[PDB]
Amino acid sequence: HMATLKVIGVGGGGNNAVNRMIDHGMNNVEFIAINTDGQALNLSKAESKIQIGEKLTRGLGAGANPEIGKKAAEESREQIEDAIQGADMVFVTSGMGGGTGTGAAPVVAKIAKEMGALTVGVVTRPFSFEGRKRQTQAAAGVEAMKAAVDTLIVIPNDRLLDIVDKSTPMMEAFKEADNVLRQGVQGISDLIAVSGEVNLDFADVKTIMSNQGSALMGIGVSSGENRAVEAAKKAISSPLLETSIVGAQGVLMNITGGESLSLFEAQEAADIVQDAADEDVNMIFGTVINPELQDEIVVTVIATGF
């Protein structure tokens, strides 16, 4: 069984993350671009491009009207179903607040879930300087996303203001937000790709993300002494997340290292995750021994059950 992963960007921000992720390099992952704006769709790097609402918008965007984005997605449902067909897992990424992403993303996610695919949502909330009316429209879209996905990850754009200095280019900040989705997809792709000493597969991912709600996906790489503890702290500690690790009652943790991987340091990483959750976590533990890795360790964490 080779799992089919698809990343679908809905709207301007979602299709921007898709384009940037394609530049960074992402194989075995098929990309789908959905948008009402034909101008931006023509500039997409994705192999599957779907233009919605051409009759409602005449090629333009939703003009901040979520109703238009929702109607455009439903009118093009069969075109979305065809592009998704065959996918075992789908990542719907979109920026909430606008018309297309706010109204179309929940429709694309509902279609994916009804297509029988594991549907994960990675959406952003608008900056506070964009106004309160846009934060309210984004909340409705977030609530609509949570009802149509198996698992949801919200990234408030204000958190970007915490990881930047006064000169950080805006594009460099957006790339930090893109890492949440990209590395979460790569971690899942790597898990299904290699057979581990303590093996986890796509069935484990389904059991941890199926019909849960909020979730956290993080990866952490470290070296030297205390690498296990430091890697685990990086995988669960992200300043861009609305849903933290605290309160998680279900975790899928995979530690990847060389032949030096110690049982003692594996328990350290697990304890770090459970202690940080401050809950009695139902954990699914896996271990992969990559002899190429020298003194570096990788901790992948998928946390749900909030």
Ligand SMILES: Nc1nc2c(ncn2[C@@H]2O[C@H](COP(=O)(O)OP(=O)(O)O)[C@@H](O)[C@H]2O)c(=O)[nH]1
């Ligand atoms: N982090 C991030 N947020 C974005 C990006 N592009 C747009 N957004 C956010 O997404 C919201 C909706 O914008 P957009 O997706 O382009 O509108 P739409 O195409 O009509 O859905 C905006 O309020 C932005 O705050 C991006 O590249 N990165």
Ligand SMILES: [K+]
């Ligand atoms: K595996």
